[PDB]
Amino acid sequence: EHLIAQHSAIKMLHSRVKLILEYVKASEAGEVPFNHEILREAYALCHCLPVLSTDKFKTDFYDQCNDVGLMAYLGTITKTCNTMNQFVNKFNVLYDRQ
């Protein structure tokens, strides 16, 4: 559901890009030769598309990934020890006494 949820959002944006791309293709052949502030801005948004990142943003982006990634590692350890605890409890009844 989480991935389909982002799949719908990307599809929504993907449909918008198709409309812009088709309009430019039609303008190259027919339509209005220049819709003025629209294609001017549409080009500006294709230039703003590569959001420039500096060293600090990649520093913080990797900072967030490592923090929760460690949290993910802790969650796996917590799940693993519970399975170990269940294994130990079952093993102490399988052959062991007391």
């Binding site: 993910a72 969650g75 796996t76 799940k79």
Partner: protein, 177 residues
């Protein structure tokens, strides 16, 4: 490097599959020199201890390689370079010996760059086993600082999306069950 590693693996396999239990002297020499190349001092020392004294007596080149290895263990770079260039190495040993020379040069260069904010020009020349002035010009073209008055050298210390998504899926699948 990669070819040297493949040769080392092949020589180790040949040693393990030796018919009479004793490898040919070229194989032992290649093994020892390649262990010296990778700075694997423990493996080289154990291999030298494993070699019977009959090979050592019948092949003084093996003794020379062992002396070079002992010099590497003591990390006396001028002595290391002097000993390497003193003994004539056969066609199977000369290129790998020169590779060991280059590896030692790079190792000393990195150690000086890391540990030494300042170093005497003579000390750096001894560490690299090269004359002082051309070493100075080589480090100047390396973007370093050198003081002529005090003869001191100031070295300058220098996941794809597909792999991530696979790891993220393995996050959920492990926690899903």
């Amino acid at each position: 490097a990669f070819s040297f590693k493949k040769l080392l693996d092949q020589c180790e396999n040949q040693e393990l599959e030796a018919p009479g239990g004793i490898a040919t002297p070229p194989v032992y020499g290649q093994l020892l020199a390649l262990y010296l190349l990778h700075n694997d001092m423990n493996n080289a020392r154990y291999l030298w201890k494993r070699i019977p004294p009959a090979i050592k007596s019948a092949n003084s080149e093996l003794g020379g390689i062992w002396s070079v290895g002992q010099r590497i263990w003591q990390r006396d770079f001028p002595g290391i370079y002097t000993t390497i260039n003193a003994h004539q190495w056969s066609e199977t040993v000369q290129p790998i010996m020169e590779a060991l020379r280059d590896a030692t040069r790079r190792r000393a260069f990195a150690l000086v760059s890391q540990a030494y904010t300042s170093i005497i020009a003579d000390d750096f020349a001894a560490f690299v086993g090269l004359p002082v002035e051309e070493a100075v010009k080589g480090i100047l073209e390396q973007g370093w600082q050198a003081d002529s008055t005090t003869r001191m050298v100031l070295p300058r210390k220098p996941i794809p999306n597909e792999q991530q998504l696979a790891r993220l899926t393995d996050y959920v699948a492990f926690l899903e069950n």
